[PDB]
Amino acid sequence: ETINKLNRISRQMLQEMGREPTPEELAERMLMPEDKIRKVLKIAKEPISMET
Amino acid sequence: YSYTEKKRIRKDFGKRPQVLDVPYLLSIQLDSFQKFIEQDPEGQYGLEAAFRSVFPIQSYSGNSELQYVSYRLGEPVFDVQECQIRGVTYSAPLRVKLRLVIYEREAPEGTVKDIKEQEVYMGEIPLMTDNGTFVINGTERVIVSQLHRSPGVFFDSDKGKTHSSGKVLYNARIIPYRGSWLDFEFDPKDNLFVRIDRRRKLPATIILRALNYTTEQILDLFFEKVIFEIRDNKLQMELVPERLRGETASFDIEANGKVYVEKGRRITARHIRQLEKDDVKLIEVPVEYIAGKVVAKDYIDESTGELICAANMELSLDLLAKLSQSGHKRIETLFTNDLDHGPYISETLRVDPTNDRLSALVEIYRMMRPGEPPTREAAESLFENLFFSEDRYDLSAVGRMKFNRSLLREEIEGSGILSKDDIIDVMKKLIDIRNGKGEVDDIDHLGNRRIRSVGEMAENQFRVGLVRVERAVKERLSLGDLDTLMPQDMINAKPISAAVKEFFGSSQLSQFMDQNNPLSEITHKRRISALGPGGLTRERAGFEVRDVHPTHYGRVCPIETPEGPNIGLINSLSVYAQTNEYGFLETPYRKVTDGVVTDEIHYLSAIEEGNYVIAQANSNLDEEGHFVEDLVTCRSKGESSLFSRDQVDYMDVSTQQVVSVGASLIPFLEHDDANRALMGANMQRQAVPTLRADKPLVGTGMERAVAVDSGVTAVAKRGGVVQYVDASRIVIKVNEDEMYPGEAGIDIYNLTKYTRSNQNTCINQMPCVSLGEPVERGDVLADGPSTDLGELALGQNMRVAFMPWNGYNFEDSILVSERVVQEDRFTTIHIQELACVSRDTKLGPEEITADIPNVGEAALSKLDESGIVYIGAEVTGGDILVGKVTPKGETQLTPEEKLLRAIFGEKASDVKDSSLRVPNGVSGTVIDVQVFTRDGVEKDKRALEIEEMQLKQAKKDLSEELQILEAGLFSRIRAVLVAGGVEAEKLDKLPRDRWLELGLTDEEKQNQLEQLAEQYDELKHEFEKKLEAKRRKITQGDDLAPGVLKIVKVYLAVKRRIQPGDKMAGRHGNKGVISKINPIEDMPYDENGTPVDIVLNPLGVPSRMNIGQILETHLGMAAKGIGDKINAMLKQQQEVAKLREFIQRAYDLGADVRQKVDLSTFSDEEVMRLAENLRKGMPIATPVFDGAKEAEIKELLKLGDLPTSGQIRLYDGRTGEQFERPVTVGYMYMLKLNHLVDDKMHARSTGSYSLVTQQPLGGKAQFGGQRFGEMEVWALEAYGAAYTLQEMLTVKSDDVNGRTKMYKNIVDGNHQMEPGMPESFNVLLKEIRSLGINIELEDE
């Protein structure tokens, strides 16, 4: 759910900020410690097929 | 004549005048993208069109509509250079206006509220440079133009191979730009069939029913009518007298009280003429002749209301009686002939499973989406959505054009969707082809071949983005609340941005520009490909499409194509070629009206050129330009022969127009076999630039055009005088006539200095002009890499001798004097980009610190306090460029190691050394360093030193700009003030800043002063904002990948000269690999005592027939001759008269050439410089097929003092004794391709290993071993060597135990192997056992 909210913020602030919000931008928009973005933003990614 | 031509003139042989001069060679690349991104106030291709296609997006019936207004492209975030340094893409933000309207519910249509969302941002679209290149990640890239089957209809054969009964078959294919394919095809039974895409075959008529045609209308469409009357009683018939052609009388043919034909007599032209002139409309026939006739329409009994006969049924003697008593006067039958008008459609109906529209639609819907229950709305929707929907189907303009044209229609433009008339007409043309009238087209013809380019493809990918955003918009407009959301919340960025990013980043047609070379660039940018999307595959299409077509003339170069797996699937664009208005290929021609050859140029496409008889590039006309012979070699349709004097409509523009820019650079090409010419033009692009750009001694005259058109050089924007010349920049003072009134001016050129090319070569510009020199507009200000004085030098010319030398030249091998490696001419400068990545590991972050566990003071010396290498420090293999350390704690050592630590009291660090070091064996100097930092992380010491440095250099540069500019402007104000109020000594006294107050008498000059005021201030503030922006760009943290804290990129410049194992080649397809580097002492020399640079092998010349390389040598020699003479006459310092005389003599050369010449040029200062440049050798031009002749070469050799033979006496530098026989010595232009051996060389003992299956793999760029394949194994099998093989596939590679147990024995001095079982087979055992299969190893 956290990841999803993080996506919402991106969707709104993307054209609003003109390029994309900085990696620390959605951080304050989100309630939690806000460096967590990076951490979360990493673990969210699905592993690439080794057969790619 | 121009100003750099006064510096150097190339002597040009050849006769034919150039009626047209070579255009911009980059035309295609720039024009395409020029069309893509642009504002076109109509449906012509561009972002506008692709917008107007999918838009406006309306919801499903909900009357919430999203309409597109207009768009714009924002200024680039980083400019080209900055984007190249940092590694981001050079692109513009796309800002598009969207208007969201909501219709009041239960309208007459009117809007509750329409919110216009101002320019929602979707994606960033890449930009093309002035050179036709894109920068994707810090790297220039080119998008190859595509060649595919043009949209439209097409008729083919497929005779032969199918069925082996012959009879051919005939098929039609409708290929749209977008949407499903529509196919028609016959069969051996002459039943017409239709298939959508490659899918299931259906009887043709089944589609017609879906267009709502009853059987009656199908028959009425495809056949004529044979009328039968029962009048009085018993069987008359209407007769069109032409109907009896190609047929024999079945009975007595008689009417009008006169018997025209009798039974058993074939009806000929005579009978038919007799019937025509006597005008027999109606004849009497037997009741038995209709036994085979096929009834046209339906027939029912008027009384009983029952069906007597269905449409398209074979009548019988009894059926006739049954419909006759019902009161039927007339019967309509098909007109059927097995020769002229064929009975195909009828039998097609005979195989048709359906009856009515709905039924056909059912079979179609169950064809396209089989197994799932068909529905009425489903079949209707699918079928209407296939070829008939504006959304899912377009042939576009080229498609509709070629379609209508091939159907022999009038309209050249029409709807993008098919019509009943369209499909029907296509079927008609196919049936006509089977009937014997009309011919089948061929796929290889360039009229059926269409060229796309960057713009079109980018348009298509963006189109896909727009459709995937359309689905989303309609998805959201479904449940939407009214005034809350706007055209932002729905439309995303990532889908579009990635739609374009995927295209430019990875695509088979998008590639890294091949820049090792100005020829390579420009020849890459002009290229065609039949591969990729919309095209065929190498595995699919065979020899035909690859093979050179007659239509390739003047459009596609016959001799330049790759030699590999894809041959002729690429080709290249011809010199004078152009993309047609519709997107075809057209080539220049000269119109011949009446008996004269007119100098008016004409462009003819592949089909346009077809019927006209075109004359030859090489032909003899004179005076008024009338053909000198009474018949001349020409080519009319697909072939060539002798044609009558006045027949020919046109003539070739130039002699070169058949070939490309690569082939046009080969001297004496006409004398080379096509294979070796191919190989030659193929290799000429692989030439690495030299340290000193030389010049070709033996030229063509194209090299100038390649040099200038390609962006490697620096060309004057406007003519003027040079104010300043630095190795850094060049400042030119503009002439007034070319100068704009405002902002005064001077044109400042910032030259590219040493930097990394795509191929890891060096790209560096050098100034070709001096302080205070006149420069014409469009003149070369600076030379790029491999360009000399405005020409293209891809390599260096040298003295070469053909003769076997001690077998050191053995196959193609090259034997080169030490004089060459000493002169450092063939030396090359490589620029490598190395990187160091600071990452985040769960054990901790990685430090770039200069504190590295286990390194001597010598190792940490070349690094500063921060851990990065100093700019300029020369390094070699093993040197540390960037110190990097990553945490790994608790080594977990063992007992003996613990004892060792106990004795030696060493603290084993918790840190591991990851530092980036120069790859083994390579060595060079550091020309630059960059530090990218995550935004917000503290910049270390080095990065801050660098940042401050860059800031200072920035301020200095900008200040220079503003200063030279301001002085340039005030210098103009000074001049304008002097008209109308001149004060000479008075004005320059008072401070310049106070000049603007002073006015002038009433005139326009006051308004000019005003202009310069305005622009002055503009520049003044523009400086400010530019400095601000530069500062922010320097200081800002560059965005980085996940986990990477900082990145340090070091730029090395390696200088490698030449060594045995390197590849070198002429322009003629003659390769070689340098064998030995031989002392000047042992070199063959002539009586004059001048050694020869290179010794080639004569045996290479006869077999591969390239005789040009010999001619090139001879003329080359002669060229140098003209140089040497001059070189003496200057060293004699004779005078202007003697030199002038000799040079003129040289430039004249017997009779009949087109060069012209001097003494319009200044007799002293200009001439002496010309000779000064000529003294190296006299540059000669040999136009492709117009080139020099033997007699001309010998004649120039006479002027040279050198023999006609081109051969002289040579002596072995070893024994000093003469060589028997004369040997050929001359000057051959030679290229160093980059195959260089210190790249190619690899060796491995024990390296890393692959995880999944344990096998040798390079992870360090420490190479994996060689691959031992099946054939090598067989070769080991033929020999009795078992152990070599076993160790080859067990211990040396695949055995995880075997390799180490081996290595230990190898160092122990015991050669053995304890093989074990290979890990491949071991894994395979599990893979087999992972299934329901039990695989075991038995016995003992």
Ligand SMILES: Fc1ccc(-c2n[nH]cc2-c2ccc(NCCN3CCNCC3)c(C(F)(F)F)c2)cc1
């Ligand atoms: F530019 C030129 C110069 C000379 C000739 C020429 N002069 N005399 C005969 C030929 C000749 C005839 C046919 C072909 N190839 C096959 C093309 N046919 C037409 C329809 N498509 C398939 C078959 C060629 C060529 F160039 F391909 F080799 C040359 C033709 C063009």
